[PDB]
Symmetry: C2
Amino acid sequence: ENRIQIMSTIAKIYRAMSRELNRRLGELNLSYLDFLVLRATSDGPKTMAYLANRYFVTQSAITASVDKLEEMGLVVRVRDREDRAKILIEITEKGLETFNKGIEIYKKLANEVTGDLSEDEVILVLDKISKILKRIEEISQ
Amino acid sequence: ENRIQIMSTIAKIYRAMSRELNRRLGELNLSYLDFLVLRATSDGPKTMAYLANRYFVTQSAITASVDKLEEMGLVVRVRDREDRAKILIEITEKGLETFNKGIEIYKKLANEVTGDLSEDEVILVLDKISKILKRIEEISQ
Ligand SMILES: [Ca+2]
Ligand SMILES: [Ca+2]
């Protein structure tokens, strides 16, 4: 029915978007996951546990992405002055510049895919699916 | 902006849904991917290449899922009478019964997550995001 198809359509959109984002982000030497790590750290340092949980990936996947971004000079591991065991992933100036280029790629793609929708239609959809997100996040965890 | 957030919200919804589906489908001894393989074959036999492409996963992931469903007696590998190299994954009666239970789990979860949306609101969203899906599929491949 309708409610089923809304969720299945969201899934198909995500898969297709993920494929294209990986392709376009590739020119920035990033994968979609790498870009998400930069997005997460762009507004403040994040624990690796947070990253894995928030974006639903394995801790090994986060370790791999962070190791990569670190070698690329986009993020750094920050340790507590009294306990270096406590780690936070902090974005670098270079990381922020790359993130900004990535967000622009995202912006352009988003405009393209929603091209059939007028500003108002975009508004209706956003407001409504925002409620779906709130519920599933309350349900799943 | 709005168009960006529509796509990012869709992504968050997908991740959260995926987590919960894996959890609920688990009781049916299935992962979300396994369930998708059953969904794909429920209406007709599918090539393994199709499965990997349609649901954006690696061929090794499909091989693993198909090997599993085959051992579970939910699907079978069908070969051409003149060229056994040509393979199609066909669902079994048991596979269809399990798929049906899976679709019911999906149905209930969908009703829950879209609970804040009235039938009409569900209609508006579906019609509109369907256009987004058409575009991204045209763009990505
Ligand atoms: Ca909860
Ligand atoms: Ca095309």
